[PDB]
Amino acid sequence: MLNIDSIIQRLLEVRGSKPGKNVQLQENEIRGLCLKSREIFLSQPILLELEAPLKICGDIHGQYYDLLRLFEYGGFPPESNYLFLGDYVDRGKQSLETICLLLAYKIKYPENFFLLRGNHECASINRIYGFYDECKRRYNIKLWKTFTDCFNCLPIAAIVDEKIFCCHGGLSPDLQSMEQIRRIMRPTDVPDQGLLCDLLWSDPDKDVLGWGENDRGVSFTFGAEVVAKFLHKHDLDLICRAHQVVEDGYEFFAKRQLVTLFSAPNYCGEFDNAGAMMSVDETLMCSFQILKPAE
Amino acid sequence: KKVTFLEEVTEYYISGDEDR
Ligand SMILES: [Mn+2]
């Protein structure tokens, strides 16, 4: 049984502290977040049907204090509805606090707060790129395994007011009907190839005509005409995805038919990128707020 | 309903995000 209010209070009380300060939840509280959120994820569709207004964010990658700033600008749940597009952990310094606050908000406000799966919400990936090490250092391996069980149940895509298709990575040459996404059974790992892999790993590319091999070595690239055909076939207006660092935190593709959102400013302390958050109002007017890193 | 975009972007500066 969770005391979700106590948990959220402790996660938020480090606001304003010298950045890097940890929240020390009890192991059983974190396990509790994983178990309860898994129940909620499985009870909701794997392809979410959402209504505007809401705010949409891309990659967070453990940048907890930047996540807190996103909520300060966007409004703390449930003042605003949120959809996150995946990649909550790895690379950054505070993945545990990041995923714990996100799961806590999912549990407290399950119809106002939504999380999609990113390619880092995958044991084979986050074992390597930081999350496993963080779990091992602060708790133990068993807790990392508990997170994996939770991540294996995250929904994969969302459609906002029947017009905006959202997922972490991108399109798939295997995808002919949304029903194919709906028939993916959870829990599941991410496969090395196939529909679910593509939805989490693929990228748009201005220099490809049709589909191409992705330079990453996983999945595909797709061109602007692929986007156009997808939108026309499914009566959609916009693809909203994440999965690529972009200078200004958001970047359009194919004459604004696709947008990439990335919400982790100065990613890895390497990229000097802004993080962006997209607001969608009830009329589906989209606007951007961007967090620019400064000295 | 139709997706549209506001041209005005709201920008914020986050101090300390360089050299965390
Ligand atoms: Mn990604």
Residue numbers in the entry:
A (entry chain A): 6 to 300
B (entry chain B): 639 to 658
Quoted from the paper:
In animal cells, eIF2a phosphorylation is reversed by cellular phosphatase complexes consisting of a protein phosphatase 1 catalytic subunit (PP1) and a substrate-specific regulatory subunit. An RVxF motif, common to many PP1 binding proteins, is present in the conserved functional core of the PPP1R15 family members and their viral counterparts, and plays an important role in assembly of the active holophosphatase complex. Our studies reveal the essential role of a third cellular factor, G-actin, in endowing the complex with substrate specificity and provide the first glimpse at the structure of a ternary holophosphatase complex possessing such substrate specificity.
PPP1R15A and PPP1R15B both formed stable complexes with PP1 (both the PP1A and PP1G isoforms were tested) but crystals suited for structural determination only arose from complexes between human PPP1R15B and mouse PP1G. As expected, the side chains of V641 and F643 (of the RVxF motif) engage hydrophobic crevices on the backside of the catalytic subunit, an interaction common to PP1 regulatory subunits. Along this path PPP1R15B Y650 occupies a position similar to spinophilin F459 and PNUTS F411 whereas PPP1R15B I652 occupies a position similar to spinophilin T461 and PNUTS F413, whose side chains engage the ϕϕ motif binding-site of PP1. The side chain of PPP1R15B R658 engages a deep pocket on the PP1 surface, occupying the same position as spinophilin R469 and PNUTS R420 and forming a conserved salt bridge with PP1G D71 in the ‘Arg site’, as predicted by Choy and colleagues. PP1G in these crystals conformed to previous structural determinations of PP1 isoforms (RMS: 0.19–0.29 Å over more than 240 Cα atoms), indicating that the binding of PPP1R15 did not change PP1's structure.
